[PDB]
Amino acid sequence: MLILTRKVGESINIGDDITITILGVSGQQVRIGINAPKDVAVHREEIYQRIQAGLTAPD
Amino acid sequence: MLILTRKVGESINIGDDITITILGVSGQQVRIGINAPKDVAVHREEIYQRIQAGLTAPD
RNA sequence: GGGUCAUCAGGACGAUGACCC
RNA sequence: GGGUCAUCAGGACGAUGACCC
Secondary structure (H helix, E strand, C coil): CEEEEEECCEEEEECCCEEEEEEEEECEEEEEEEECCCCCCEEEHHHHHCCCCCCCCCC | CEEEEEECCCEEEECCCEEEEEEEEECCEEEEEEECCCCCCEEEHHHHCCCCCCCCCCC
16 A cells, blocks of 8 residues: 545546546545546446456446 | 545545555545555655656656 | 644555644 | 535536534
């Protein structure tokens, strides 16, 4: 893992083709954004487990 | 962009080799984690501009 | 013991300071 | 107009509800 801190309204980068932006907070909830090509995919870690089961194109 | 809400202590996924975790919250500040192979890079958006300058090979 | 704010930083659920009770 | 809490979700700085002044 690589851990660090950010402030609401700022960003982070990954894989030189992906970007992340902490849009703001709401208590224990945090609104966040992601920016990547459709050449890759993004989901909550639960929704991901419904996909990595053997596919990349659900119903 | 793909926007979401995740609570402190949960995770998200990107591509097929990257994972993210919202480690906690501290007001306008947030602590976040990333998990990917060293075959890819991760940095603050501020540090990123020192790396995309023409080398993609930090100090 | 609890709450709140901020800073430095790296592949580590990172590290540190400050303020209030 | 301001603050606080919560839920659903898609490639959109997403959408909605609730509580307090």
